[PDB]
Amino acid sequence: AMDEKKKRPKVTVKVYFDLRIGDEDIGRVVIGLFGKTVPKTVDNFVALATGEKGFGYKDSKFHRVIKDFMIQGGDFTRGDGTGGKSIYGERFPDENFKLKHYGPGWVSMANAGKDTNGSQFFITTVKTAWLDGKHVVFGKVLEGMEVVRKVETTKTDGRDKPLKDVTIADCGKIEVEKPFAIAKE
Ligand SMILES: [Zn+2]
Ligand SMILES: [Zn+2]
Numbered sequence: 001a002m003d004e005k006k007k008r009p010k011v012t013v014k015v016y017f018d019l020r021i022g023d024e025d026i027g028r029v030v031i032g033l034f035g036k037t038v039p040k041t042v043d044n045f046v047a048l049a050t051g052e053k054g055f056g057y058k059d060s061k062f063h064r065v066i067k068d069f070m071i072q073g074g075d076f077t078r079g080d081g082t083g084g085k086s087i088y089g090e091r092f093p094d095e096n097f098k099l100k101h102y103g104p105g106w107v108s109m110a111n112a113g114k115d116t117n118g119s120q121f122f123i124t125t126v127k128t129a130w131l132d133g134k135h136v137v138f139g140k141v142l143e144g145m146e147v148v149r150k151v152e153t154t155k156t157d158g159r160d161k162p163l164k165d166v167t168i169a170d171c172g173k174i175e176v177e178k179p180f181a182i183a184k185e
Contacts, residue, residue, distance in 0.1 A: 084119035
């Protein structure tokens, strides 16, 4: 079907992450970001990817990995899940819950309850509907889902911490010439 009448979010900007497991380069993940739907949340993530406020994601780790669920990172202050901050302060409100965790590859803010978004985020590896309405969804992996799956399946300990550090070796912003809609899947 052409799906003329299905409602869809638009990718307005992209971020790339070049990832490593231990000292091995494993490839690039490119995330499309929904800047018309959740501008405040996207602007935070993009600024943290560029490092332009003097802090950000470069060389931070994915400190919590759960196979058949998600990979979580973004704690660039403590690297353990206790830290991170947004460009608006330590915490900012949930912007909206317009988007859901529709399937593998959706990118969403980690939190410790209502209105506690900072810098930590996760990339789902399955549909995670139980987080809908609780975590703010703001992007989707468009390239490099296979690289996400390498992280997803890395050996972890009983606290879900990778045995070898999984790091964002490089990251930044990629401009999108013309915003484009994607399926809610
Ligand atoms: Zn080596
Ligand atoms: Zn939660």
